[PDB]
Amino acid sequence: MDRAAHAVEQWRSERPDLDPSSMIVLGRLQEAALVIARDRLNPLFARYGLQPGEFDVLATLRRSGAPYALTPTALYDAAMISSGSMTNRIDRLEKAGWVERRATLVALTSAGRALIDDAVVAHVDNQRRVLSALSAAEQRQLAKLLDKLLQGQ
Amino acid sequence: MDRAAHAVEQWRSERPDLDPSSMIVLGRLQEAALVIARDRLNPLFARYGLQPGEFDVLATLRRSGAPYALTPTALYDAAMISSGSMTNRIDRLEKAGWVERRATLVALTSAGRALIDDAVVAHVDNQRRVLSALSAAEQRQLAKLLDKLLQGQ
Numbered sequence: 001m002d003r004a005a006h007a008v009e010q011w012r013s014e015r016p017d018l019d020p021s022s023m024i025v026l027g028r029l030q031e032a033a034l035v036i037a038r039d040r041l042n043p044l045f046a047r048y049g050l051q052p053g054e055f056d057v058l059a060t061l062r063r064s065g066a067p068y069a070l071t072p073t074a075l076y077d078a079a080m081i082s083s084g085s086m087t088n089r090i091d092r093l094e095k096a097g098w099v100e101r102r103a104t105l106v107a108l109t110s111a112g113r114a115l116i117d118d119a120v121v122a123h124v125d126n127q128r129r130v131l132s133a134l135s136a137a138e139q140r141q142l143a144k145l146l147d148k149l150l151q152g153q
Numbered sequence: 154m155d156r157a158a159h160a161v162e163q164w165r166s167e168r169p170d171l172d173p174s175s176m177i178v179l180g181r182l183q184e185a186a187l188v189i190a191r192d193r194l195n196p197l198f199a200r201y202g203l204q205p206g207e208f209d210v211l212a213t214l215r216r217s218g219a220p221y222a223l224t225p226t227a228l229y230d231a232a233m234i235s236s237g238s239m240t241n242r243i244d245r246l247e248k249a250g251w252v253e254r255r256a257t258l259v260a261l262t263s264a265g266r267a268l269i270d271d272a273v274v275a276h277v278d279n280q281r282r283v284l285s286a287l288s289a290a291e292q293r294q295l296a297k298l299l300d301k302l303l304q305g306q
């Protein structure tokens with residue numbers, strides 16, 4: 001038994017007045033997101049010198065198209081993940097020489113564009129290996145269920 | 154289109170040499186975990202004065218059974234989520250009067266036991282509403298896929 005099933009098993013024994021069924025899916029959702037981020041995605045970003053969430057900024061700017069420049073608001077709306085601390089991430093990336101601030105726009109530098117062009121290839125290869133245990137149909141069904149859950153929020 | 158599908162759509166246009174299919178499921182996994190934690194679960198914990206991750210410590214101690222006392226190692230292995238900073242969470246909970254340190258064991262106080270007995274009821278009710286958009290079968294299928302993905306790590 002994994003953490004979530006063992007936990008639900010203990011609750012049914014200790015608090016039988018409770019219906020702890022919902023704990024499994026949401027506990028596995030949070031643990032999977034945490035373990036994959038911590039042990040799979042972020043070490044790869046770290047090989048490229050990218051902190052948690054800095055990849056998203058570079059990736060969002062790159063896939064917007066030349067000249068790879070977005071307002072900070074467009075940058076937030078087009079981000080893959082709605083995490084916070086966007087001002088401090090742009091600051092960090094500017095000190096590293098990967099973004100600059102034109103006009104208000106945030107723009108990939110040439111070094112930033114090359115970095116993300118390299119990183120995204122290794123990223124998607126890393127992602128497929130993260131999902132290799134799921135079949136193509138299992139991945140698509142998992143993307144459907146996550147969309148339905150996410151729309152419901 | 155959600156964030157993940159719009160992002161994949163942009164990549165297929167900007168980097169057609171890439172296969173960005175894996176981005177949807179893992180982007181939706183991370184965004185769903187983040188939005189549910191931020192906008193659904195943690196505000197409820199906050200109503201009870203519980204910081205992110207402090208609920209897990211109390212819940213783990215409670216469902217272990219009387220006298221609700223575990224070693225910090227048993228506490229980590231039985232946690233629902235393998236998040237870090239466990240020493241600083243036990244410190245925080247001890248200053249609040251919800252855990253104490255017997256012998257090395259971490260133990261719910263009476264106030265801590267009552268708090269988690271109250272919180273867990275509101276927690277599971279809150280969780281069902283988080284998952285209300287999914288059918289009982291959709292939730293079970295989502296728990297199966299997340300287990301397969303999590304075992305594969």
Ligand SMILES: O=c1[nH]c(=O)c2[nH]c(=O)[nH]c2[nH]1
Nearest residue numbers: 055056059060080160176180
């Ligand atoms: O275009 C992106 N694809 C991802 O898979 C991803 N992940 C992330 O954190 N940011 C982005 N951006």
Ligand SMILES: O=c1[nH]c(=O)c2[nH]c(=O)[nH]c2[nH]1
Nearest residue numbers: 007023027208209212213233
């Ligand atoms: O027994 C638990 N159930 C949960 O649903 C949960 N969530 C969390 O953070 N800790 C715990 N513990």
